[PDB]
Design a protein around this nucleic acid. Sequence first.
RNA 1: CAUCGGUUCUGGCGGGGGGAUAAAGGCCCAGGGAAUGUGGCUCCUCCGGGAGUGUUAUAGCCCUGGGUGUAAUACCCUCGC
RNA 2: AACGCGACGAUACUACCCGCACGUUGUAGACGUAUAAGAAUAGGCUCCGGCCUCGUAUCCUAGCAGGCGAUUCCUCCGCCGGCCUCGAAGUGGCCGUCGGUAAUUCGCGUAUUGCAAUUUAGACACGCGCGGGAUCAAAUCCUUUGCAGACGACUUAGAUGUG
Lengths: 141, 108, 79, 98, 62, 190, 42, 203, 174
Amino acid sequence: AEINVEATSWRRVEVGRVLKLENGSLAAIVEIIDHKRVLADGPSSDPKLATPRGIVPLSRALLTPIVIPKLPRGARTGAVKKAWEAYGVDAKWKETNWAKKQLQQERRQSLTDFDRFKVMRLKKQRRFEERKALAKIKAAA
Amino acid sequence: PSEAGHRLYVKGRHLSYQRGRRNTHPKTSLIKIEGVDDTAAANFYLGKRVAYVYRAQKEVRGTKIRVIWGKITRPHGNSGVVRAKFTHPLPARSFGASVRIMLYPSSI
Amino acid sequence: AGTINKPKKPTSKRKTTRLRAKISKRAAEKKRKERKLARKNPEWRSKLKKDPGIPNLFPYKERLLQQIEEERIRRKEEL
Amino acid sequence: LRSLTTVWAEHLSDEVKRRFYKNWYKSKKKAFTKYAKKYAENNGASITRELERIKKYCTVVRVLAHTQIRKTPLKQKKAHLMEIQINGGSVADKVEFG
Amino acid sequence: AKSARASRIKENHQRFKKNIAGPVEAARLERLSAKLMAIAQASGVKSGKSIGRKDSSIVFPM
Amino acid sequence: MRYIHSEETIPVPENVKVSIKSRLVTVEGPRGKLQKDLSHIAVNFSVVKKGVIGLEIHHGSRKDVAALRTVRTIINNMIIGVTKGFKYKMRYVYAHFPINVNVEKNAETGCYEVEIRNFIGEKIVRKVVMAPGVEVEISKAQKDELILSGNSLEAVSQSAADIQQICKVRNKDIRKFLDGIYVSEKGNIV
Amino acid sequence: KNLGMRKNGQVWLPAKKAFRPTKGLTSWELRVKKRQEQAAMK
Amino acid sequence: SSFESVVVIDGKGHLLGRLASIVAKQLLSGQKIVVVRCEALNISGEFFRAKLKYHAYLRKMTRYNPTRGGPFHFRAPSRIFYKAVRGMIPHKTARGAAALERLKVFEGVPPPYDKKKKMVVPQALRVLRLQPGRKYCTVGRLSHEVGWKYQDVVARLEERRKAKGAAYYERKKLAARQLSEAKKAAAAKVDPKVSEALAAYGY
Amino acid sequence: MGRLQEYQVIGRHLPTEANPNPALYRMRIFAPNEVVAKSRFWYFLRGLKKVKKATGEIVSVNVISEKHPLKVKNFGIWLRYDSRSGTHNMYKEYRETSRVAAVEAMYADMAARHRARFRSIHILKVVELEKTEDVKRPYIKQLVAKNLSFPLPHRVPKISTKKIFSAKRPSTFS
RNA sequence: CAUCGGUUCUGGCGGGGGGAUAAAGGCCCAGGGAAUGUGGCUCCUCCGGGAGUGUUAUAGCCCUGGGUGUAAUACCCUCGC
RNA sequence: AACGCGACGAUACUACCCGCACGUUGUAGACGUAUAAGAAUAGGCUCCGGCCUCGUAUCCUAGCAGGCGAUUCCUCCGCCGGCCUCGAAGUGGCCGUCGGUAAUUCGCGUAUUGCAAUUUAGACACGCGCGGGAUCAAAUCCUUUGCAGACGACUUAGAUGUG
C-alpha cells in the first residue's frame, strides 16, 4: 500500500508563529482569539521589527517561516522576549528572502538623483561585461 | 549620440468638469495625474501649473499650436484626482485629452 | 416547468406613482384603524406581563438565584 | 469561410470571357491576358505557389465551371460561371483533381 | 401523429440511412467518381515550393 | 457555524496503488485502473499513516463537512472496484413471447452491445451499448440471466439501468403484462 | 466479511459512522457533572 | 495608475459586469482597450440562470417590424461583452461614441495580439471575487447554446496558437538559462568596487 | 452599536423635606458618550423606580475601563430582545478581550442575525466565564480546544484598487 | 517672482490640564490558586505520539496587595509655532 | 448589413509604383506613448540547486534635441540581399554586406533665447512637385431582347460573326 498525494501545504497559524505586518514589523502569536483575530507581541530590540502586544487581525498580516518552539499559550511579554532572544528570531528574519526584498526596496527608495546616475553608469559597465559573456556563450552553442 | 528622452512634465488626463449629477461647471476641471492615486500624493502637485496644448488650422505668430494655461487648485475625492483652474475653461471635446503638469513653481 | 427555455412575461419591479400613493394611504388608514380598535378593544389585558426568567444555559443561574434568595431574606429581615 | 485565393486556367473561352463584360463588342477583350503570362513566366511559379497555398491552408475546394452556351439554341452568347464543390478525399487530392 | 422533428422518427430515419440507402448511394458515388477519374486522367522561393507572400484594420494605428 | 477542522479516513489494501494530484484520484489494483476527477469539491488530501489516506476541510460549513463523506465513499468504491470488482446479475422473464438476447463485442469501439428481440412480440430490435469497461455474458448456470461485470460501479449499474429501461411496457396493464429485464442480484466479482 | 443485510442491497457500502461535526468538544465526565448541577438547579 | 498606448486584456477568468465596468471607465477616461478571449469570460451563478436571462432577452423584439428598432440579439461572446460595456456608456452622445471607438473585442487571440502582453484585472477575477462553492458559467458555453456557430473553429485556432506558444516558451527558457550562465560567468570580470557599489545601491 | 464605553452612572431623587437623604441608584451603561449614558440611565429609572429626570439628578458618571485588555476572555451575555411576537431571552457567548468589545460584537451579531436595533435590546448581564468548563456554545468550544492550530486556505492577495491592470495572475496560497 | 492684507482648505511640530492623578504593561517584593498540566514519574503503542499523577521543576499562566510611579501611552480638552 | 468582409480580372488620364521635397493639410489627442508562455488557485514554477504576498519588476536610459577630434571597444542598433518561415484580419528567424555606435578616458565648442512662456520635434492618412520605372481600360446613354417589367431596374445582343 503505497500512496502518492500532491496537495497544498499551508503555513499554520499557531502559538509561536511569527507574523509580518503591513508596516514591516514582526510579532508572534501568543493566543488565538478566533479564525480572524489573534493576540500577538513583538518584543524585538530592533525598533523597525518591534510590535506592541495587542490584537492583530489575520487579514492585516502575513506568515513567516519562523515558528518559536514550545512558546506557552498566553505567555506575557517577558517570557515572549526570552523565547524570542533565545531562538534568535531577528537573525532568521534577516536571513529570509522577504527581508532581503524589503531592504532592496528601501535602498532603491532612498536613492537621490546623483545616486541614480551612478547606478545607470555602473549598470551599463556591468551590462557590457555580461554582454561579452553572453556573446561568448552563444558563440559556443 | 544620446537616446534618452526630454520630458520634464508629468502626464495627465482631462476627465471632466466639476459637476453634480446633472449640472456641470466649466470653470473648474478634473485632472487625473499619472501615478497620483491618493490625496497625499495629490498634495505635492498643488499650485503646479498645467498646460493644455492643442493644434489649430491657421498659423499665428509662427506656430499652429496653442496653449491654455492653468494651475492645480485642490485635491478632489480620495483617488488623487485634482481640481484645476485655467485662464479659459477647457473645451468639452477634450474630455480624455492629455495635459502637461509642469514641476514649476517648485518648492524643492 | 419550461421556464429556462421558454420564459414568460417578466414581473415588473418598477412601481408606479399611483400605486405607491395608494399603498401609503392604505397603510396610514390601517394604522389609524388599528389604533381605534386597540382603543375600543374589549379583550382582557393583564396589569403585569409574564417575565420569561433566567435562561437555563446561563452558567451562573444557580448563583444568581442564591443572591435572589439572600436579598429577599435580607429584605424580610430589614422589614 | 473565407476565400484565400483562386487559380485560373491558362486559356479561357470567349463565351466565359463575355461574363466579365457589359459591352463586350466595344471591348478590347484584355481580360486574363496578363494572367495568362504567369503560366509562361518562371515555369508557372506563381501558379504553383498558389496551388501549394490552397493545398496547405484551405479546407474547402471548389472548381470554377462554366456552360457552353453556344451549343444551346439561346441567342445569349454570354456563358454562366459557378463554383462547384469537390467533396471527398483530402485537400491535396482535391487540388490535384481540379 | 409523430412529427418530422420527433426523436423516434429521427432514429428510424438514421437506421434507414445507415442500413439501406447508404450502400446504394456509396456504390453510385464510386461509379461516378471512377468515370470522372477517367475524364480527369485523360530554390523554394524561385520555384514556388516555399510559399512566399503574394505580390479596415485589427489594430489601432501606431 | 463554521467548523475549524473536519477529517475523514480511507484505509487502502496492500496491493492497491492510490495517486492523487490536483484532486484527480487514480486507483490501481490487480483488476486494472480507475480514474476520477474530484476538483469540484474543496478538500485537502494527505497521507496520515502508512496505507491510510486523510481527507480534511478547513473553515467549512456543515454542507462542506458533509461532502467529505461522499468523497470517502466514492474513493472506497474505486478501491473495491479495482480489488474485487462489481457484478450485476439480471434476469429476463416473459409470459408468451420468449426474449431473444444476443451479446456481442464491437471491435472498433471495444464496447459490448446487447440486442434484444421478440419483446412481447415486437418486430423492432433493441440495441443497448455498454459503457467502456463493462463486460456482459449470458449465464449458463441459471436460466434467462445476464451477468454484467466491471471495475466501475457507476458504469456497470448504469448499463444495467439502460437494459431495464429499454424493455419498458407501454400502454398495457403492468399487473398483467410482466415481461421485462430486471436486476436480480448485486455484488462483487471476487 | 459482512454478517448483516443492508436494506437497499448496496453491500459494498462501508459501515458508516454518525454525522457528528461537533464531536470531541466536551468530554463525557464533564457532561455527567454538568447534568448533575443542571438537575440541582432545576 | 499608468497611461498606455493600448491595453490588451485576457478575458479568461474575468467576471463580465466587473470587467465591463472597469473597461467602460477606462474608455471614457481615454485609454484604448483590447479584450481577447471573450469566449472564456465568466458569469456568476449557475448556467441555467444565464441561459434563462438570454432567453428572456430573446423574447424582446419589435412587434410591427423585426427588421428595425428592435433588440438585435448578437450571439457571439465578444458581442455579449460589447453589449455589457455599451450598457455602461452614454453611447447616444458623441463622447460615448468616441469612447466606444477605443474598444476592440475578439474571440480567441488573433494576430498580432498573440505576440503581445495580455494583462489582467484583479478587481474582476473570478478566483479572487467569487466565494468558494459558488457556481459560475462560461460565456462561450452560453453563446454556443444560444446559437454561436464558431466554437470549434476558435478551439482549433487556440490549440494551434498554444502549440506555437509552447515552442516559443521552450526558446525563452533556453534564453533565460543562457542569460543566468552569462551573469554568473561575467561576475568574475566585473570590477569588485562596482559590484559592492551596485549592491549597496540595491541592484 | 459604535465605539462604546462602559459608564458607572449613579443618580438619585431630588432631596425633599420628607426625604432628606434619598437612595442612590447605580447602573453600568454601554453608550457612545456620557449624554447617551445619562439618557439611558433615566430611561431605565423611569421604567423601574418611577423616578423621573425632572425630579431627579445625576450624582456621578465615571468610566469603567477594562482591567486586563490584553488577556483573551470568554464572555457570556444574557439579553432580552423585542420582536413582533414579544420579548425573548437569549444567552450568547463572545470570545473577546474587553467587555465593551463583547457588547459591540453582541450588537453587530443581533443586527446581523435577528435584525434587532439598539432600542430593542436590553443587556441584562455580561459575565466572564471563569473556567473553560463554563463554555456552552460549540463555536467557542472549538476555539478553546487544546493545541488549536489551523491553516488559511484560499487567501485572496491584497492588491491596491488604484492599480487597475496586473501583468501576472495572482496566487491564493499565502 | 518677492513682501503684505482679507477669506479659506490642508500637513507637521513643541508644551499644559483631566480620568482609577487613565486603565494596561516592563522590572522587582509578599501571599493564594488552577489547567487547554511544563519538567519528572507510570502504562500503552503504528515508536509517531497518546492516557494517568500534580502545582514549577529542565515552560509558563491566573488572582490579590505593595514599590518604581506624579511612569509611559490611548482618549478628551487646551496654549502656541 | 444599401455606412460588414473576402478572392480574382482589366485598369486609358492629371491615373499606378519607386526616391526625396515639403505642407497656414487632417485626425476623441505621441513625448521611452518598450515587455507573447500555457495552466492551476484545497496549488504552481524551475536552470532540478531550489523558488512563489508584491510589476515597488525587466529592458532601455549620459554626449549642441545631443557637435567636432581622439583614446578605446567588438557591444548594441538600422537599411538592404539570400534562404527559410508566418493565412484568425498573414511577418518574423538566421546568415552576409554596408552605415552608425563612451563599455574607459580626454581636448575644443555651447554664452546673448537676457529670471518662465508647447520642448512647434512622432505615427498614419491626404495633397502639391520634380527625376525615373511600368500600362494603353471600361461603364452609361442609344438600338435591341422578353427568361423581365407601372416607371426605373433585370436577362440578352450590338466591333466580320455559328453575327
